[PDB]
Amino acid sequence: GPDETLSLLADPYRFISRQCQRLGANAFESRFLLKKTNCLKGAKAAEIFYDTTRFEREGAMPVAIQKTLLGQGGVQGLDGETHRHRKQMFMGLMTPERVRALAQLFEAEWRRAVPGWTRKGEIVFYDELHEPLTRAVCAWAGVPLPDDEAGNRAGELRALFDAAGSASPRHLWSRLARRRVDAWAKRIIEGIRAGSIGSGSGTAAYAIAWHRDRHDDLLSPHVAAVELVNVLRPTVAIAVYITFVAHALQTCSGIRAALVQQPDYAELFVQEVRRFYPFGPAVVARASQDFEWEGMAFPEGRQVVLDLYGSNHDAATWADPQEFRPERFRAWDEDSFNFIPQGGGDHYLGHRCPGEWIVLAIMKVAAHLLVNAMRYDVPDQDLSIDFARLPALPKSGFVMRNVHIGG
Ligand code: HEM
Ligand SMILES: CCCCCCCCCCCCCCCC(=O)O
Numbered sequence: 001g002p003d004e005t006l007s008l009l010a011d012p013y014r015f016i017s018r019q020c021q022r023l024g025a026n027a028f029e030s031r032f033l034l035k036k037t038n039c040l041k042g043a044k045a046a047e048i049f050y051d052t053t054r055f056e057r058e059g060a061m062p063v064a065i066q067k068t069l070l071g072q073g074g075v076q077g078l079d080g081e082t083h084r085h086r087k088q089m090f091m092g093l094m095t096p097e098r099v100r101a102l103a104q105l106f107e108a109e110w111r112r113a114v115p116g117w118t119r120k121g122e123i124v125f126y127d128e129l130h131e132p133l134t135r136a137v138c139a140w141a142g143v144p145l146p147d148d149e150a151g152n153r154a155g156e157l158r159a160l161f162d163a164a165g166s167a168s169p170r171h172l173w174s175r176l177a178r179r180r181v182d183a184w185a186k187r188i189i190e191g192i193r194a195g196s197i198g199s200g201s202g203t204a205a206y207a208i209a210w211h212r213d214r215h216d217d218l219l220s221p222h223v224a225a226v227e228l229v230n231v232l233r234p235t236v237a238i239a240v241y242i243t244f245v246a247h248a249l250q251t252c253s254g255i256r257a258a259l260v261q262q263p264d265y266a267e268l269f270v271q272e273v274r275r276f277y278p279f280g281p282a283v284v285a286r287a288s289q290d291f292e293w294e295g296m297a298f299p300e301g302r303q304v305v306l307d308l309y310g311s312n313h314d315a316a317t318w319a320d321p322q323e324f325r326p327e328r329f330r331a332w333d334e335d336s337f338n339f340i341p342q343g344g345g346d347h348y349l350g351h352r353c354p355g356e357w358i359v360l361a362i363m364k365v366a367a368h369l370l371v372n373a374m375r376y377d378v379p380d381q382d383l384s385i386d387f388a389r390l391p392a393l394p395k396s397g398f399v400m401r402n403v404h405i406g407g
Helices: 005-010 015-023 043-049 063-070 080-091 096-120 125-141 147-162 169-194 204-210 221-236 238-251 255-261 265-276 308-312 326-331 356-372
Strands: 027-032 035-041 122-124 283-287 291-293 296-298 303-307 375-377 399-404
Touching: 005 015, 005 027, 015 027, 015 035, 015 303, 015 308, 035 043, 043 303, 043 308, 063 147, 063 169, 063 221, 080 221, 096 122, 096 125, 096 356, 096 399, 122 125, 125 147, 125 204, 125 221, 125 238, 147 169, 147 221, 169 204, 169 221, 204 221, 221 238, 238 255, 238 265, 238 356, 255 265, 255 356, 265 308, 265 326, 265 356, 303 308
Parallel strands: 035 303
Antiparallel strands: 027 035, 122 399, 283 303, 291 296, 375 399
């Protein structure tokens, strides 16, 4: 079989579902970086992908992703009881009270940033979100962040996710940003352990710095650093979803009115933004033993990818997935496998994103501010979603003019 890495990279979000569509199947065999790969889509496929008796993550992450997006030694690369113990550390951070606290900090940082946006006249909304997110998440996590360093640190965190998948010198910047962010986070962990940094007992950096593994040993400082960055970086990546919130408000008739007057609408709206827009790329695992499924062979060791975007657009589940319709979530049964913008299955027993509560809370803050507080003009621009970009974004980055918050 031919290597299809280039075709995938040219259409990273839609390649799998388009090929599935052509074959009339929810799975097909392909090859990426010269490695045979079964590509899966849909709720039934997601349920098998999350069966940890059939799939493992250890050794499955391509080195280039380790050197940019994720780091090395983090929870994403663990299996079994080692994984579940590490995953508990992240899950303990996500209490309703703590999630609310981060959302409040973010609202405050967004409001603090507005005067600067007004003074600029014209802004690229996406570009402006990374710093307020960085400031909020650092404060929340007990990470000191001097005012004069916040801009630079926000740029480094952005590079980890925004420049990692760029086929350009930007990827090299992502690699340098990873080296810098790991070293910075390690100094934070070291300071906490030495008692020179006074992070609170409820904060992420404290929890991670003092986490004991299954042998009652502290994480090595590098691993602790990577895990701390696994809180900081993806919180900054919410800039992408906030940009999509602004995009939906701009391009979908009736949405703004519904959000303004119907209090229960915001929850439905944020979920539909997660369903509708591409963001999370396909997740990778490896078959842990020989099995067969739906007439497809999964030999032990076979690389397997789960298409999140395609699953979120599966007509069997949604009927009319092509339409942006928040109302559809009134009929959702909260199934753990059929709606998977940040993974499927169970949070404790699998690799599902622990950041979902934070993402939902911050997206609701964004939707609230964009319809009830923040006034802005939207000049003529290319708002179409760039499906060739990782992460995907409106081509313009969502340009605003005349931004103020006295409305
Ligand atoms: C910004 C939008 C986000 C998207 C699109 C996203 C998506 C995902 C996806 C697809 C996975 C992998 C699921 C799997 O491997 O089966 C994941 C895992 C993870 N996410 Fe997120 N996430 C986001 C935000 C967050 C936030 C805000 C946090 C932390 C505060 C976070 C922390 C993590 C961690 C630590 C993992 C690894 C969990 C594990 O391996 O057990 N994510 N995320
Ligand atoms: C060309 C080399 C490929 C590089 C790998 C591309 C990975 C970038 C993916 C961007 C999606 C962003 C989703 C957030 C992920 C996270 O924060 O953990």
